[PDB]
Write a protein that binds this ligand. Structure first.
Ligand code: NI
Length: 111
């Protein structure tokens, strides 16, 4: 209906995490690859991405994002974000990246 947040977690155990999230949100993954899984959750509106970690023992934040409706929304956000003094990097618009002050990366992207 509108844009949704994208939470990408680096997880130590991809299979265990798929099963927990399937129970948390009541649905199975939309896509499953080696080392990668994703969920398109309708309520709460969310794109949850699970990325299999290499070394560490605990789940960490990999990146955050805002999944918008069409490519045109990406360009609108890109223009909005720049007029604000935020340093943006565009991929070609299909994706814009900005980084928060503590280093957390955000992508605004069309799916
Ligand atoms: Ni992503």
């Amino acid at each position: 209906h509108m844009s949704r947040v994208q939470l990408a977690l680096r997880v130590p155990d991809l299979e265990a995490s798929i099963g927990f999230y399937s129970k948390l949100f009541g649905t199975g993954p939309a896509k499953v690859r080696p080392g990668y899984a994703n969920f398109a959750i309708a309520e709460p509106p969310l794109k949850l991405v699970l990325i299999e970690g290499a070394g560490e023992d605990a789940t960490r934040l990999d990146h955050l994002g805002v999944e918008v409706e069409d490519s045109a929304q990406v360009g609108h956000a890109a223009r909005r974000l720049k007029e604000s003094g935020l340093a943006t990097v565009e991929e070609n618009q299909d994706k814009v990246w900005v980084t928060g002050p503590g280093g957390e990366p955000w992508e605004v992207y069309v799916v």
